[PDB]
Design an enzyme around this catalytic site. Structure first.
Site, PDB file in Angstrom:
ATOM      1  N   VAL A 193       3.811  -0.878   4.385  1.00 12.46           N
ATOM      2  CA  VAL A 193       2.465  -1.363   4.656  1.00 12.46           C
ATOM      3  C   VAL A 193       1.867  -2.116   3.474  1.00 12.46           C
ATOM      4  CG1 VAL A 193       0.123  -0.689   5.358  1.00 12.46           C
ATOM      5  CG2 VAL A 193       2.119   0.560   6.220  1.00 12.46           C
ATOM      6  N   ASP A 246      -7.177   7.557   0.677  1.00  9.43           N
ATOM      7  CA  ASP A 246      -6.726   8.462   1.726  1.00  9.43           C
ATOM      8  C   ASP A 246      -7.175   9.886   1.366  1.00  9.43           C
ATOM      9  OD1 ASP A 246      -3.141   8.600   0.838  1.00  9.43           O
ATOM     10  OD2 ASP A 246      -4.831   9.685  -0.026  1.00  9.43           O
ATOM     11  N   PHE A 263       7.163   5.571   8.240  1.00  7.95           N
ATOM     12  CA  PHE A 263       6.449   4.597   9.059  1.00  7.95           C
ATOM     13  C   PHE A 263       6.825   3.127   8.788  1.00  7.95           C
ATOM     14  CE2 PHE A 263       4.339   3.964   5.148  1.00  7.95           C
ATOM     15  CZ  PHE A 263       4.259   5.248   4.586  1.00  7.95           C
ATOM     16  N   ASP A 318       0.906  13.838  14.121  1.00  9.91           N
ATOM     17  CA  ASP A 318       1.136  13.920  12.689  1.00  9.91           C
ATOM     18  C   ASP A 318      -0.183  13.964  11.910  1.00  9.91           C
ATOM     19  OD1 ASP A 318       2.671  14.100  10.351  1.00  9.91           O
ATOM     20  OD2 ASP A 318       2.843  11.901  10.201  1.00  9.91           O
ATOM     21  N   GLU A 374      -6.552  -2.899  11.131  1.00  5.89           N
ATOM     22  CA  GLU A 374      -7.879  -2.973  10.550  1.00  5.89           C
ATOM     23  C   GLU A 374      -7.793  -2.319   9.167  1.00  5.89           C
ATOM     24  OE1 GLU A 374     -10.587  -0.699  12.938  1.00  5.89           O
ATOM     25  OE2 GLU A 374     -12.045  -0.426  11.304  1.00  5.89           O
ATOM     26  N   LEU A 410       0.837  -1.196   0.000  1.00  2.06           N
ATOM     27  CA  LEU A 410       0.000   0.000   0.000  1.00  2.06           C
ATOM     28  C   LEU A 410       0.877   1.253   0.000  1.00  2.06           C
ATOM     29  CD1 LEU A 410      -2.796  -1.059   2.499  1.00  2.06           C
ATOM     30  CD2 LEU A 410      -2.933  -0.859  -0.003  1.00  2.06           C
ATOM     31  N   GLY A 411       2.104   1.130   0.502  1.00  2.36           N
ATOM     32  CA  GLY A 411       3.016   2.265   0.523  1.00  2.36           C
ATOM     33  C   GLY A 411       4.125   2.036   1.522  1.00  2.36           C
ATOM     34  N   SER A 412       5.138   2.887   1.508  1.00  5.58           N
ATOM     35  CA  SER A 412       6.230   2.759   2.463  1.00  5.58           C
ATOM     36  C   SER A 412       6.825   4.131   2.697  1.00  5.58           C
ATOM     37  CB  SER A 412       7.320   1.813   1.947  1.00  5.58           C
ATOM     38  OG  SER A 412       8.140   2.457   0.983  1.00  5.58           O
ATOM     39  N   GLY A 413       7.547   4.282   3.799  1.00  8.90           N
ATOM     40  CA  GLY A 413       8.158   5.564   4.102  1.00  8.90           C
ATOM     41  C   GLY A 413       8.665   5.621   5.526  1.00  8.90           C
TER      42      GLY A 413
END
Length: 269
Positions: free
Chosen positions: A20, A92, A17, A131, A85, A12-15
């Protein structure tokens, strides 16, 4: 055995955090989100030692609310895996605003209201997100409900001063920029002001440090006098001059909010 009970899907994405992935709990096909965090990349550990994020999420995950819940977590040799969840279908807030541009005030009101309720829930549970921004807000497109994500820069809420910050800079307050000091609630209110402006104008108000400390808000889109007023209040230069959550929700502009389902039927379906 996290590998057995979950069927991993695309990234779904990364960075900042971590990474994911979309997922599905093999057990009951419950859709989930799997977050991976390398241990070498986390400074804040809570109490066994686990990333603060796990502590924070457990405090706010009980009961229903507008925050993405922690379903379970696993520790690996060099990383931690959190099972989150995952509503569906979802987009988004960042993508939603990029595609639609500025949002009608009726829609911004409903969205902003839900974000406020989510943030009050966290504060009520002793958690400070730190954030708040469009990229960390999920929209359930069918039910019209918003959910808060990414507590990786959060902290336990306290009444004393914070001297640490690793959230998004263009959403950080003038007091953090100038003195590296801020208080929880009032810093949150400022980020909520940036968020609201973002929603009604289609983009954030400030880009450079000098604009943040100048604090003058210029409106690039037509916005009602009452909305402009709430925005400038949330963005007051002096922390103590900003509104409390109660004052924001009792503001003239915040009255007669639509229900999530009405919101979806009118603006999302």
């Amino acid at each position: 055995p996290l590998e057995s009970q979950y069927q991993v899907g695309p990234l779904l994405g990364s960075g900042g955090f971590g990474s994911v992935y979309s997922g599905i709990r093999v057990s009951d096909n419950l859709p989930v989100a799997i977050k991976h965090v390398e241990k070498d990349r986390i400074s804040d550990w809570g109490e066994t030692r686990v990333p603060m994020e796990v502590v924070l999420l457990k405090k706010v995950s009980s009961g229903f609310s507008g925050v993405i819940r922690l379903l379970d977590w696993f520790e690996r040799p060099d990383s931690f895996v959190l099972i989150l969840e995952r509503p569906e279908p979802v987009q988004d807030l960042f993508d939603f605003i990029t595609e639609r541009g500025a949002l009608q005030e009726e829609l911004a009101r409903s969205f902003f209201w839900q974000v406020l309720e989510a943030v009050r829930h966290c504060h009520n549970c002793g958690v400070l997100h730190r954030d708040i921004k469009d990229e960390n807000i999920l929209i359930d497109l069918n039910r019209g409900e918003l959910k808060l994500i990414d507590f990786g820069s959060g902290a336990l809420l306290k009444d004393t001063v914070y001297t640490d910050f690793d959230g998004t800079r263009v959403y950080s307050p003038p007091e953090w920029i100038r003195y590296h000091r801020y208080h929880g609630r009032s810093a949150a209110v400022w980020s909520l002001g940036i968020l609201l402006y973002d929603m009604v104008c289609g983009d954030i108000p400030f880009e450079h440090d000098e604009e943040i400390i100048r604090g003058q808000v210029f409106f690039r889109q037509r916005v009602s006098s009452e909305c402009q007023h709430l925005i400038r209040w949330c963005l007051a230069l002096r922390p103590s001059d900003r509104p409390t959550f109660e004052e924001i929700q009792n503001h003239p502009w915040m009255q007669d909010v639509l229900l999530p389902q009405e919101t979806a039927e009118i603006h999302l379906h």
